[PDB]
Amino acid sequence: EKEILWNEAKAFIAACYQELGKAAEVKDRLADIKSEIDLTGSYVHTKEELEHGAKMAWRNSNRCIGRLFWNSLNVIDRRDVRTKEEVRDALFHHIETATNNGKIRPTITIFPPEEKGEKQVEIWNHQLIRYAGYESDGERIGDPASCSLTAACEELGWRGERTDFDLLPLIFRMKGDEQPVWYELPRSLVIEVPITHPDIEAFSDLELKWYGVPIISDMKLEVGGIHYNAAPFNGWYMGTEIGARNLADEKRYDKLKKVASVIGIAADYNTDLWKDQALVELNKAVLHSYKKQGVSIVDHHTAASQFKRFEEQAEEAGRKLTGDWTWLIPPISPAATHIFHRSYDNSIVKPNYFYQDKPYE
Amino acid sequence: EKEILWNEAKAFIAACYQELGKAAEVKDRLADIKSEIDLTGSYVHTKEELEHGAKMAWRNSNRCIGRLFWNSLNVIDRRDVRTKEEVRDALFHHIETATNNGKIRPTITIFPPEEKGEKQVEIWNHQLIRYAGYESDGERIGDPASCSLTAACEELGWRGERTDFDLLPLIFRMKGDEQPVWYELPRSLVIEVPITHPDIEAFSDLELKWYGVPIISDMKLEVGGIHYNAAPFNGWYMGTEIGARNLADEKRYDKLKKVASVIGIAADYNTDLWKDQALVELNKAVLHSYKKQGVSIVDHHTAASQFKRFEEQAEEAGRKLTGDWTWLIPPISPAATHIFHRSYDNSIVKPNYFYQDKPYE
Ligand code: HEM
Ligand code: HEM
Ligand SMILES: N/C(=N/c1cccc(CO[C@@H]2CCNC2)c1)c1cccs1
Ligand SMILES: N/C(=N/c1cccc(CO[C@@H]2CCNC2)c1)c1cccs1
Ligand SMILES: C[C@H](O)[C@H](O)[C@H]1CNc2nc(N)[nH]c(=O)c2N1
Ligand SMILES: C[C@H](O)[C@H](O)[C@H]1CNc2nc(N)[nH]c(=O)c2N1
Ligand SMILES: [Cl-]
Ligand SMILES: [Cl-]
């Protein structure tokens, strides 16, 4: 067990210190770690290792198109938290600093790691900011992707107003406790963007909106054998995530038919390509709405260009590039991006972010 | 060598006869084949085996979304040809019968197979009907994908008029001959569709058009160890092939900027999603134009629905399904199809159609 930890530690420190220009400080740091592992059963990252490890992990995320700015990640070290009030305020602070009045800072807050595979902090939220979902005999409300977590929260004394956009509470469980606590979100901390169209005034009749900052809070950060199961991170949205998936998928908000209505086209014939046309106008609306409000967002064409630069930067730096083609291509006009026309190695490189099992369900 | 042939033969005949309800006739047919191989070094398919083998090959084509109608394939047995006039007239006939006045019949014409890996007939065309491409100091004309074949044809005494839509000649080489012959296509045999838009009259200013029937003529059909290197096949187009790739790719006709102009939108900002909007209108134009002229075509939504039925038909029949996710998803709105949201096994099953090296280049 402390063998696999030692092995990953050797690989990580060598690479991390190499990139940081600290290649000479390796042996003595690896020395201390080997002792610390022998005596304690684990080791503790320096602030520098942790910060860079979180950046390397983003860089190795095969499914991420926004990796160009991996080195500008804002890393918050909250390994000091011991109380649920401390966790809550850390999460509250993350939302505030990442939002930054709309000029979103890509940020990660890092909580204490697993000890013996035992979690210190266990976050139930998929994202820190997400809408509830309800299904009750034919009546479908909100975000269906949140149906299971919502039912779980309502098992704990929470109650949603049952709008299509109920903000889910923060819900996490501390080590020792049998149940998670939940805290309602302060509305003043959550930026939302109402969806309007630049040309079509009737688009507002849909009363669509989305939240400003996507903060993934259910993935495990792995850095040199250390498992930070609780390390919520954020960037800004690519418009397609909202307009082509969240609001378009039949198993999500399923709004394409209503979009077709308000833009004045029939939704009767496949050969009219009404879904395609609705997707374009909806995605135009999303980008326009975020930019009009001053909330950071990127379109899929610009993002692909940035990713091309990331590919170029990688080869120039002598690093192997890895990627998941199936996730890197945007869900609209993917053949209009260079991504579609080349292949990527889907090998896993650590440090990285990983899926982990949900405590609920 | 006759070991691998015998092995593939055993696997094929057993499966083919099983599907045909002729499972009892297997041993005696396998008997004759084993003798025929021993004495001759190869074996000859019955008409029934060949017809069904060609259908099974289509069914096993992982990259094909149109596989629902695999069993309705029109198979033409031209293993009898010996002369280049016979080949030419066979190819001429294929075009005519497949076109069928616009009501396209999915058809394959099968020529004599390789003997000792030696080709009887060697087709140079990618498709029987395709446009030439020219590149001469900054001057780019026609289809760039045809640049190498065009130069090759012009090395043989052919000369194109250098329009953007020069019909390439049929070009193939007979066994024994050192050079291929080429035959100009009779215009009366080639249906073309001028591209118009249902709502936007200015779209005709682009003077776009495409050919009616895509007839792939450079792939090898493999059936039970027998290599039919020359077996051109056709179906009808999925609109996206023309509107989202052939006319949209920068390395093809690259028409999106001009489409944006004629539909009256700016092509200046990525966030306007002008490429996405142009793709939709161009693809609407393509579908409308084919249907208006009475030439068979399918949109990507309908095609995906048909493919879903193919998936259902396959499981119901107890057959494993194989597919290439990266090719099955349409290049526009793929997330609007069920294909995007499931995975496919990309295993190779024979019989099948395979790539083979180009004689030119
Ligand atoms: C800066 C702006 C960013 C943009 C525009 C961006 C874009 C994207 C997009 C569009 C996806 C696909 C998500 C989906 O389809 O559900 C993605 C996946 C991902 N991104 Fe990023 N990203 C950004 C920043 C970050 C940051 C800061 C991290 C973490 C340090 C990160 C790590 C990931 C990971 C781990 C995934 C895959 C999640 C999964 O497998 O489900 N990205 N990114
Ligand atoms: C009936 C109408 C048909 C439709 C709508 C259809 C649709 C498609 C499409 C859209 C592709 C992708 C082509 C590309 O992206 O370049 C494809 C690939 C393919 N189709 Fe079909 N197809 C049809 C009939 C057939 C037939 C009759 C055959 C042969 C018996 C066939 C075998 C294949 C093969 C082998 C490929 C892959 C070619 C490659 O790997 O480059 N299909 N099909
Ligand atoms: N733009 C983003 N979009 C996403 C990035 C990663 C994941 C997700 C949502 O998670 C997937 C949705 C369904 N399965 C996992 C969204 C980011 C969130 C945090 C940093 S970038
Ligand atoms: N619809 C079609 N489209 C295609 C199907 C298969 C292949 C192609 C074109 O070949 C690819 C284009 C570039 N590489 C190979 C087009 C068909 C042609 C013949 C039967 S169906
Ligand atoms: C690299 C990638 O495999 C390549 O660009 C593929 C992607 N999927 C495709 N799918 C289809 N139908 N046709 C294509 O030409 C391609 N190109
Ligand atoms: C089956 C397939 O892998 C799945 O639907 C994937 C495809 N590519 C994707 N790409 C992104 N960015 N996001 C997704 O949710 C998916 N879904
Ligand atoms: Cl999201
Ligand atoms: Cl084509």
Q: Which residues of A define the annotated binding site? A: 64
Task: Kindly give, in sequence order, each residue whose CB lies less than 8 Å from that of residue A28, ignoring residues fewer than 6 positions away.
Answer: none
- Mark yes or no for CB contact B287/A273 under 8 Å: yes
Q: Measure Cα distances from A359 to A122, A291, B148, B226 in Å.
A: 8, 37, 59, 56
The reply to whether B325 belongs to the active site is no
Please answer whether residues B133 and B143 qualify as being in contact, where contact means their C-beta atoms are separated by less than 8 angstroms.
yes
Please answer whether residues A273 and B244 qualify as being in contact, where contact means their C-beta atoms are separated by less than 8 angstroms.
no
Measured CA to CA, the distance from residue B192 to residue B7 in angstroms comes to 45
**Residue B340 identity:** F
Please choose, from the candidates B194, B164, B214, B203, the residue with its C-alpha nearest in 3D space to the C-alpha of residue B282.
B203
Q: Which ligand sits closest to the CA of B56?
A: 2
* CA Rg value for chain A: 22
What is the CATH T-level fold of the domain B80-105+120-191+355-359, as seen in this structure?
Answer: Nitric Oxide Synthase;Heme Domain; Chain A, domain 2 (3.90.440)
Segments of chain A assigned E as strands: 74-77, 107-110, 121-123, 133-136, 139-142, 170-174, 181-183, 192-194, 209-211, 215-216, 220-223, 226-228, 233-234, 237-238, 297-298, 352-354
Please answer whether residues A193 and A170 qualify as being in contact, where contact means their C-beta atoms are separated by less than 8 angstroms.
no
Specify the DSSP class assigned to residue A241. I
Q: Is A187 exposed, middle or buried (0-12, 13-18, 19+ CB in 10 A)?
A: exposed
CB-nearest to A291 from B271, B283, B336 is B271
Measured CA to CA, the distance from residue A284 to residue A319 in angstroms comes to 36
Q: Which chain A residue is nearest to residue B335, measuring alpha carbons?
A: A331
Measured CA to CA, the distance from residue A332 to residue A303 in angstroms comes to 13
Task: Kindly give, in sequence order, each residue whose CB lies less than 8 Å from that of residue A169, ignoring residues fewer than 6 positions away.
Answer: A153, A158, A182, A183, A184, A185
Please answer whether residues A196 and A204 qualify as being in contact, where contact means their C-beta atoms are separated by less than 8 angstroms.
yes
Specify the DSSP class assigned to residue A281. H
Segments of B160-219 assigned E as strands: 170-174, 181-183, 192-194, 209-211, 215-216
Specify the DSSP class assigned to residue B205. G
Q: Sign (positive/negative) of CA torsion A233, A237, A240, A241?
A: positive
CB-nearest to A244 from B256, B326, B335 is B335
Distance from CA of A345 to the nearest CA of B (A): 14
The reply to whether A67 belongs to the active site is yes
Instruction: Write down the catalytic residue from B78, B236, B274, B281.
Output: B236
Ligand 2 contact via B360 beta carbon (within 6 Å): no
Please choose, from the candidates B359, B310, B302, B355, the residue with its C-alpha nearest in 3D space to the C-alpha of residue B330.
B302
Distance B238 CA to ligand 4 centre (A): 10
- Mark yes or no for CB contact A302/B270 under 8 Å: yes
Please answer whether residues B229 and B357 qualify as being in contact, where contact means their C-beta atoms are separated by less than 8 angstroms.
no
Q: Which chain B residue is nearest to residue A282, measuring alpha carbons?
A: B273
Measured CA to CA, the distance from residue A235 to residue A33 in angstroms comes to 32
Please answer whether residues A222 and A249 qualify as being in contact, where contact means their C-beta atoms are separated by less than 8 angstroms.
no
Nearest ligand 2 atom to alpha carbon B245: 15
Q: Which ligand sits closest to the CA of A215?
A: 3
Measured CA to CA, the distance from residue B224 to residue B134 in angstroms comes to 40
Q: Does residue A2 sit in helix, strand or coil?
A: helix
Please answer whether residues B151 and B141 qualify as being in contact, where contact means their C-beta atoms are separated by less than 8 angstroms.
no
CA quadruple A130, A135, A139, A140: dihedral, nearest 10? 30
Ligand 6 contact via B340 beta carbon (within 6 Å): yes
Distance B263 CA to ligand 8 centre (A): 25
Q: Whose CA is nearest to atom 25 of ligand 2?
A: B235
Q: Which residues pair with A353 in a beta bridge?
A: A221
This structure was determined by: X-ray
CA quadruple B183, B187, B189, B190: dihedral, nearest 10? 100
Percent helix / strand / coil, chain B, rounded to 5: 45, 15, 40
CA quadruple B317, B320, B324, B329: dihedral, nearest 10? 40
Please choose, from the candidates B321, B341, B347, B334, the residue with its C-alpha nearest in 3D space to the C-alpha of residue B67.
B321
Please choose, from the candidates B75, B160, B89, B153, the residue with its C-alpha nearest in 3D space to the C-alpha of residue B121.
B89
Select from A250, A273, A290 the residue whose CB has the most chain B CBs within 10 Å, as the one to mutate to test that interface. A273
Percent helix / strand / coil, chain A, rounded to 5: 45, 15, 40
Tell me how far apart the terminal alpha carbons of chain B are, to the nearest angstrom.
Answer: 29
Q: Does residue A60 sit in helix, strand or coil?
A: coil
Q: Which residues pair with A140 in a beta bridge?
A: A135
- Mark yes or no for CB contact A279/B336 under 8 Å: yes
Q: Which chain A residue is nearest to residue B325, measuring alpha carbons?
A: A326
Measured CA to CA, the distance from residue B196 to residue B209 in angstroms comes to 9
Q: Which residues pair with B53 in a beta bridge?
A: none
A92 φ, ψ to 5°?
A: -60, -45
Please answer whether residues B81 and B111 qualify as being in contact, where contact means their C-beta atoms are separated by less than 8 angstroms.
yes
**Residue A312 identity:** E
Q: Which of B74, B216, B249, B357 to mutate to test the pocket of ligand 4 (most atoms within 8 A of CB)?
A: B216
List the structure tokens of A244.
């082509």
Where is chain B discontinuous (C–N over 2.5 Å), named by the preceding residue? Answer: none
Instruction: Write down the catalytic residue from A64, A78, A153, A222.
Output: A64
Q: Is A169 exposed, middle or buried (0-12, 13-18, 19+ CB in 10 A)?
A: middle
For this experimental structure, what is the resolution in angstroms? 2.0
- Mark yes or no for CB contact A336/B280 under 8 Å: no
Q: Which residues pair with A167 in a beta bridge?
A: A131
List the structure tokens of B360.
């030119």
Please answer whether residues B337 and B304 qualify as being in contact, where contact means their C-beta atoms are separated by less than 8 angstroms.
yes
- Mark yes or no for CB contact B275/A336 under 8 Å: yes
Ligand 3 contact via A229 beta carbon (within 6 Å): no
The reply to whether B64 belongs to the active site is yes
Segments of chain B assigned E as strands: 74-77, 107-110, 121-123, 133-136, 139-142, 170-174, 181-183, 192-194, 209-211, 215-216, 220-223, 226-228, 233-234, 237-238, 297-298, 352-354
Q: Identify residues of B whose CB sits under 8 angstroms from chain A CBs.
A: 244-245, 248-249, 256, 270-273, 275-277, 279-280, 283-284, 287-288, 291, 299, 301-302, 305, 325-326, 331-336, 340
Please choose, from the candidates B237, B256, B332, B285, the residue with its C-alpha nearest in 3D space to the C-alpha of residue A275.
B332
| Residue B64 annotated as binding site | yes
Ligand 3 contact via A14 beta carbon (within 6 Å): no
The reply to whether B252 belongs to the active site is no
What DSSP string runs through B299-312?
-HHHHHHHHHHHHH
Measured CA to CA, the distance from residue B264 to residue B197 in angstroms comes to 13
What is the CATH T-level fold of the domain A1-79+106-116+220-234+304-328, as seen in this structure?
Answer: Nitric Oxide Synthase; Chain A, domain 1 (3.90.340)
Please answer whether residues A37 and A2 qualify as being in contact, where contact means their C-beta atoms are separated by less than 8 angstroms.
yes
CATH of domain A192-214+237-302: 3.90.1230.10
Helix residue ranges, H only, B100-158 = 147-154
Q: Which of A65, A126, A240, A327 to mutate to test the pocket of ligand 6 (most atoms within 8 A of CB)?
A: A327
Q: List, chain by chain if needed, residues with CB within 6 Å of any ligand 4 atom.
A: B 214-216, 233-235, 237-238, 241
Ligand 3 contact via A237 beta carbon (within 6 Å): yes
Q: Which ligand sits closest to the CA of B109?
A: 2
Ligand 6 contact via B338 beta carbon (within 6 Å): no
**Residue A236 identity:** W
Q: Is B127 exposed, middle or buried (0-12, 13-18, 19+ CB in 10 A)?
A: middle
List the structure tokens of B166.
């020069």
Q: Identify residues of A whose CB sits under 8 angstroms from chain B CBs.
A: 244-245, 248-249, 256, 270-273, 275-277, 279-280, 283-284, 287-288, 291, 299, 301-302, 305, 325-326, 331-336, 340
All structural domains of chain B with their residue ranges? 1-79+106-116+220-234+304-328, 80-105+120-191+355-359, 192-214+237-302
List the structure tokens of A133.
């979902």
Q: Which of B63, B67, B327, B344 to mutate to test the pocket of ligand 5 (most atoms within 8 A of CB)?
A: B327
Q: Which chain A residue is nearest to residue B198, measuring alpha carbons?
A: A272
Distance from CA of B238 to the nearest CA of A (A): 11
List the structure tokens of B312.
């259902």
